[PDB]
Amino acid sequence: SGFRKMAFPSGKVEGCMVQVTCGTTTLNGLWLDDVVYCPRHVICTSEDMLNPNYEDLLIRKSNHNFLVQAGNVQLRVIGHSMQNCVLKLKVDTANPKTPKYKFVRIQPGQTFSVLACYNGSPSGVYQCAMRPNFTIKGSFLNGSCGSVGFNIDYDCVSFCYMHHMELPTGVHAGTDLEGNFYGPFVDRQTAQAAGTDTTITVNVLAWLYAAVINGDRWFLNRFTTTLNDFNLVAMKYNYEPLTQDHVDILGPLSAQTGIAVLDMCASLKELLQNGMNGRTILGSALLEDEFTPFDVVRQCSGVTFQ
């Protein structure tokens, strides 16, 4: 038993992290096959970030201007191209540690593991979620750019996030592995405002199911509710509205615990109005929304990977 904020094993990603240097800037890159992916603002100086013209900055760069280093082995750049907001440096050597990988663009509310790196060297791993405003609440310092978020399906590594910038508000924004930013953000140092950071209601319900599995049942009440009457209360507290698709995803958890989705909603509705009265749920005094229904199933059933 027990429930922890669990990340995926990062071994298969550690062997793909390299150090990319272009001029004075040095950040991390993702070495898969004979291509290295990195944020395109590696070609910028501290002054260029205020208003960069990436097309013009890239003209004055040649293949021999990029220093790709894997530990102590130097990679030779044979060709460079800019796809959206990422650079694709084609190197001469393929990565022998290239795993069965895949590029995926996730939706808000999904979770993934982040491997924070500095100078191509791994520093730590943690789990987080794509907020509804397309930001993530991560832990990044200067030089962490190029760190990647990923999930694992048995033996396949699904890359879904590359870190690009920290907003003046302390939250983090990045792109998929094709160079398309999540949200309306751009890679320049300017005041960019994010929207309302709502709570991922479907994730909260999955977390309450995990609590019942582990013995916490005090929040179970005698009431029920309707999908509409719940969303009416949810919107008032800046909670994402619940749809029928969300009910279908919670089906397995409903079957294992013997508690209907709408009944669990009635317990949550009560919690949203009356609070938690100093009690805790799974050792937390707040409602957690960084576990998806799949995360709960995976952790409460012991799913392994290559």
Next chain:
Amino acid sequence: SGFRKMAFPSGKVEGCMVQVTCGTTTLNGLWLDDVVYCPRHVICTSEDMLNPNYEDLLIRKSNHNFLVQAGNVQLRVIGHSMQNCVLKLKVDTANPKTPKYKFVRIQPGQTFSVLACYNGSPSGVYQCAMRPNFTIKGSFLNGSCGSVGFNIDYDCVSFCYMHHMELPTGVHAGTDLEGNFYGPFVDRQTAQAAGTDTTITVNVLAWLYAAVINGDRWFLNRFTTTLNDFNLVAMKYNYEPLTQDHVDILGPLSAQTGIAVLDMCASLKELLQNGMNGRTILGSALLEDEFTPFDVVRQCSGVTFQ
């Protein structure tokens, strides 16, 4: 910026996990060099656990009774010995992926990363702490026995925990890599009661320092206090008493933020009495004690590893 419950990269440990089977029981093992370490209750049946005599059970076992499997490669057991509560199965093949490792016995309050495994296959990684009652609040299912806790110092992997059993209360107990249990626990299925689970005060202070670094300062008050007057209030709330050694460890954090240790204690003392009044600190409505002062420095400065 930002602050996350960060675990160490598990790549160097993934390559050391194997599957150990003896009769009907199958659990995980740690393959370092030509030796495989695993819990000794792998030789027990479900009935033997109620009152096992490990000496007598081990006599009826030969080297060819243990099935050590690394992925799809079979290991040959050449010699077995029982050191305290762990079995040391000497195999014929040395692990080519053996990292610079080290066995260490940690003290209560220290933190480490856990690699939860099933059938020798990694499942997830999370960070946790050795509670003052020598238990850990982990996430383990049946078959997770043999999973290891570890830290990383640059290129050296320090193994400090092996999981053995789940207590009837839902908490977890295990041994160091020499087979000595943490706490007064034994590897048999019987009612074992743990003591008072107090709060690790030194870790809470380190966490408050991390908050100030990241912009949360509302808890900073105008008071101060003495080491004795604080411990008087701490003991009332089941907090570990603070010693001078703890003050010395918080020195660097005191220098970076410009806030004296005793002043931060005065802020904590206030929080312990008046509560948090619905406010949060680093996104938490409770006082966190699973970050050591070293963890905070490491995450707020970007320490990398091999």
